[PDB]
Amino acid sequence: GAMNSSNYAELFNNDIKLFVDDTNVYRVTVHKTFEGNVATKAINGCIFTLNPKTGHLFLKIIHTSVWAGQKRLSQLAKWKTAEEVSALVRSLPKEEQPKQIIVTRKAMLDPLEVHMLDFPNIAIRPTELRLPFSAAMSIDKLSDVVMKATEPQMVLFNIYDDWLDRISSYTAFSRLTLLLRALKTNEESAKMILLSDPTITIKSYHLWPSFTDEQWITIESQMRDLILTEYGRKYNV
Amino acid sequence: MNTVPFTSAPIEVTIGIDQYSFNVKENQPFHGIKDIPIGHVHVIHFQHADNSSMRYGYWFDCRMGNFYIQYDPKDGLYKMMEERDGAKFENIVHNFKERQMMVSYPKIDEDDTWYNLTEFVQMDKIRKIVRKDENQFSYVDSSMTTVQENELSDPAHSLNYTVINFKSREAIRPGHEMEDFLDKSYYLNTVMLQGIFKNSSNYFGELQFAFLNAMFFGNYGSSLQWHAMIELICSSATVPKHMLDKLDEILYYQIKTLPEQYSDILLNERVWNICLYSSFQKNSLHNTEKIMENKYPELL
Ligand SMILES: NC(=O)C1CCOCC1
């Protein structure tokens, strides 16, 4: 059934499992027309498909041409997501295919279940966790590859950089969700924290800065403060 | 007009015959039911006074043989049997009629209810859903499970309704996943109508039989089947116009006949709200929507 705080360490066991987040698949800007009506313009999007054990991210870029001439795009986007996830699974060797796929939004359950009928042994699960994967487009290198795409494309990343050399996947996921939660709550401040010190750089082959263990503790503390702050600035506390 | 005699009535029981019912007291001199209309299937059903658990009954068609009821004190129920000696049977019935020990099937002349509930129901199809080939009649009870229920446990005692499953490879063409799931016309028209049922008459007959088993026996898997067969039509954008018109009539008479007090358990809120108000056919069931809104507005 659903994934929650009770069964949380199941994410970090050796069974292959993927989270799928569809919140950046169909993206639009809303604007006025010359006649003073409202219209939307789609921009490139992405499926965020992640292994929480290894950190491997399968970023399927959704080019705006896939929407041309189609109706009911928000509904189509869920089906397109499930089509692409199914295609990804079929492309993987049997021993790399997931035993579970956890969708971050319950509206993905039926589309994914229908597209995965050929895989009856892969469990399709919701979650009660409120995960901040929508903020993936606040990671500069991910946003850059999505916006630059001129055609459909899959790009593979490790969202943990080299962290697993020094920390466990439980701790790496906790750091990732803290960073993304911060970027979601106050992107400007979060990004200031991450780059304020120009002597700490992002390696060409990485997504985040090359912090030492001690610097990550400072960074992590700064992100918690930011989240608590904004939570006050929000509710006034 | 045909007759189903009873050897005796040794235990107190409520006896149904189609939509009618009457109480028989323990050892009351009751010897059966006469004046049963020829041309229709019928159901004779039982609920014991001491154990309302297990409503049970027998589907039959008097054109196919001479049938009677006899209580079995070992198995503890009223059993239908066939009498092969036609002269013995005629002689039995005539004696019981002369002594006026039979109830008359109490059909009002104006009244087409039973026809309207059984229009497409055929004994030959009932006998494929309920498999017991040595008898010409079919036993059903409250507890019998369906083939689909068993997939999710005695096979000989199952209701072999046609399995409908909207999230199945049968229902969903590879490469048409979204199309087939949101518009079930393929599954309805090619898979089920052309492929399995052959025609809409057989589809409606199974739908009507499922409803009647749900209503008369409280058979839960039958209720599931009835709703699934409605939903499959309503969730199809492309349905022959004669089928939609006939479905509206079928459902109208089913809703009309349902006991007002059993609507809570026999009607699935989700299916009916979807069918009447959201589905492709939301505007095609005028008679059914009107009776539902006036009789069960709470459900909606
Ligand atoms: N759970 C995984 O994705 C990996 C962990 C160990 O290497 C092979 C499977």
Side-chain angles (χ1 to χ4, degrees), chain A, chain B residues 1-151 154-300:
Chain A
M3 211 273 298
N4 55 28
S5 300
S6 305
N7 56 31
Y8 186 72
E10 188 180 12
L11 298 177
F12 310 114
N13 80 7
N14 294 63
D15 289 1
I16 304 166
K17 52 185 41 70
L18 300 170
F19 280 113
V20 172
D21 182 90
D22 70 318
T23 67
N24 285 306
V25 169
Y26 173 50
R27 296 209 288 166
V28 303
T29 54
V30 177
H31 60 84
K32 281 286 193 62
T33 73
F34 179 85
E35 294 76 33
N37 307 123
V38 174
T40 61
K41 184 185 158 302
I43 62 164
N44 291 342
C46 58
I47 305 165
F48 183 95
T49 298
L50 171 69
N51 184 337
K53 179 62 171 184
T54 68
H56 286 205
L57 173 63
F58 301 88
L59 192 75
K60 175 68 195 217
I61 304 180
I62 302 300
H63 187 262
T64 59
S65 63
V66 306
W67 311 126
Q70 307 294 319
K71 279 101 182 72
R72 292 190 51 83
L73 297 184
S74 63
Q75 174 182 73
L76 175 61
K78 298 170 201 316
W79 291 87
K80 174 56 172 191
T81 298
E83 186 181 14
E84 292 295 343
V85 171
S86 169
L88 168 65
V89 171
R90 299 166 202 275
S91 80
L92 291 164
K94 190 187 193 213
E95 70 275 0
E96 298 177 38
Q97 294 172 339
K99 298 118 198 178
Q100 294 175 18
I101 297 165
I102 305 158
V103 300
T104 62
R105 307 198 294 171
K106 305 189 208 67
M108 280 302 306
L109 289 168
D110 280 351
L112 194 55
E113 162 163 15
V114 171
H115 274 276
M116 303 286 292
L117 292 175
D118 293 331
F119 293 94
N121 300 340
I122 300 181
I124 306 301
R125 304 177 61 203
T127 182
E128 301 292 354
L129 302 182
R130 45 271 194 172
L131 295 158
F133 298 147
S134 76
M137 289 297 95
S138 289
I139 302 173
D140 288 329
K141 288 185 184 190
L142 301 187
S143 182
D144 283 350
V145 69
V146 170
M147 292 314 292
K148 292 194 208 300
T150 61
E151 48 185 330
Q153 178 180 2
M154 161 88 91
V155 185
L156 305 195
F157 296 88
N158 189 322
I159 205 161
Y160 295 154
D161 291 346
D162 60 352
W163 301 345
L164 296 177
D165 295 350
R166 302 193 67 79
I167 64 176
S168 65
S169 69
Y170 180 107
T171 301
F173 191 78
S174 296
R175 178 180 294 163
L176 173 69
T177 60
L178 175 62
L179 292 167
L180 289 174
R181 181 56 67 198
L183 287 160
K184 186 170 180 163
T185 317
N186 191 327
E187 187 180 10
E188 188 212 313
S189 305
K191 292 193 182 204
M192 283 182 59
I193 293 171
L194 286 167
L195 330 167
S196 61
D197 179 354
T199 75
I200 320 174
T201 66
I202 302 175
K203 297 293 148 292
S204 63
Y205 49 87
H206 280 169
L207 294 177
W208 310 97
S210 296
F211 291 118
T212 58
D213 290 14
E214 297 310 300
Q215 293 176 325
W216 270 122
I217 301 284
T218 308
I219 292 295
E220 291 167 334
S221 327
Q222 290 176 6
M223 292 297 189
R224 284 186 295 266
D225 293 339
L226 179 163
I227 295 166
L228 179 62
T229 301
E230 282 315 321
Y231 177 100
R233 281 173 95 252
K234 189 198 244 207
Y235 300 99
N236 299 313
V237 162
Chain B
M1 313 301 272
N2 275 126
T3 301
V4 173
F6 274 53
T7 297
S8 67
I11 70 172
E12 195 155 294
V13 66
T14 302
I15 302 177
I17 175 75
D18 300 350
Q19 77 269 37
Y20 309 111
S21 75
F22 52 98
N23 300 310
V24 175
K25 297 300 175 293
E26 179 190 306
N27 282 310
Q28 182 185 316
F30 171 84
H31 290 296
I33 305 168
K34 62 180 196 161
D35 304 321
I36 301 164
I38 310 169
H40 311 293
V41 308
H42 296 287
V43 63
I44 185 168
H45 47 108
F46 298 95
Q47 190 148 224
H48 298 179
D50 64 10
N51 172 62
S52 58
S53 316
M54 185 192 49
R55 278 179 267 165
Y56 62 95
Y58 302 91
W59 290 94
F60 65 99
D61 183 331
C62 287
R63 295 173 286 191
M64 295 168 60
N66 297 316
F67 308 114
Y68 66 100
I69 300 291
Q70 183 168 100
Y71 184 69
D72 176 6
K74 173 158 164 88
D75 288 349
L77 78 179
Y78 288 99
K79 296 191 164 162
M80 181 164 284
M81 295 190 270
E82 181 168 359
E83 177 55 71
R84 76 160 288 119
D85 188 356
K88 182 174 192 188
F89 188 82
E90 288 179 4
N91 172 249
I92 283 300
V93 173
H94 167 276
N95 174 86
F96 287 156
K97 281 193 186 179
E98 268 294 271
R99 308 222 287 153
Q100 294 195 43
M101 297 278 101
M102 302 198 170
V103 295
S104 175
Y105 188 94
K107 188 181 162 306
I108 302 322
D109 307 315
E110 160 196 57
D111 183 17
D112 270 354
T113 294
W114 190 246
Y115 173 76
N116 292 337
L117 291 169
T118 64
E119 177 175 0
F120 303 97
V121 182
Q122 314 176 283
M123 217 35 243
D124 67 275
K125 298 312 201 303
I126 291 176
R127 293 183 76 245
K128 302 174 195 305
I129 297 170
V130 189
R131 307 194 163 289
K132 196 170 201 264
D133 290 352
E134 64 277 10
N135 299 327
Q136 294 287 293
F137 46 82
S138 302
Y139 171 93
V140 180
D141 72 27
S142 297
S143 71
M144 281 170 51
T145 53
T146 69
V147 165
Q148 179 169 58
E149 279 179 309
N150 292 333
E151 301 166 351
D154 181 23
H157 209 54
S158 286
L159 294 164
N160 306 275
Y161 293 121
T162 293
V163 173
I164 296 174
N165 174 358
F166 296 140
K167 295 192 285 183
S168 75
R169 175 53 64 216
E170 294 67 37
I172 300 290
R173 283 178 297 181
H176 302 257
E177 287 83 2
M178 181 188 195
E179 174 187 10
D180 284 351
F181 185 74
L182 292 181
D183 172 7
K184 315 208 179 277
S185 300
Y186 155 71
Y187 190 33
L188 171 67
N189 290 298
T190 303
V191 178
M192 287 280 166
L193 285 178
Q194 172 179 304
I196 298 187
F197 284 98
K198 306 305 181 182
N199 54 65
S200 55
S201 295
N202 294 331
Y203 188 99
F204 291 143
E206 185 169 327
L207 180 156
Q208 291 183 311
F209 183 58
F211 170 77
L212 293 165
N213 286 325
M215 181 175 56
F216 286 129
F217 308 112
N219 185 273
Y220 178 81
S222 295
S223 181
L224 290 178
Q225 186 66 12
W226 178 54
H227 285 92
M229 298 188 74
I230 294 166
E231 192 170 2
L232 176 55
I233 293 174
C234 294
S235 297
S236 296
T238 302
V239 182
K241 310 85 165 58
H242 73 278
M243 267 191 77
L244 293 165
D245 288 335
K246 187 65 67 160
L247 178 64
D248 191 32
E249 296 301 315
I250 286 165
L251 299 180
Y252 173 82
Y253 285 101
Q254 290 174 336
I255 298 304
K256 181 170 179 66
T257 306
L258 266 186
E260 302 66 23
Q261 300 296 346
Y262 289 18
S263 42
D264 45 315
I265 52 183
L266 286 165
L267 293 176
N268 185 280
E269 191 180 67
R270 179 193 69 86
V271 170
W272 284 98
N273 272 274
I274 272 62
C275 287
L276 296 176
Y277 303 121
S278 323
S279 75
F280 287 104
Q281 304 306 338
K282 62 192 179 300
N283 291 316
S284 310
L285 305 176
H286 301 109
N287 293 351
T288 287
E289 181 168 291
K290 186 168 300 315
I291 193 177
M292 282 289 291
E293 294 185 351
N294 279 277
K295 191 178 182 193
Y296 299 122
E298 325 89 64
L299 198 85
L300 321 167

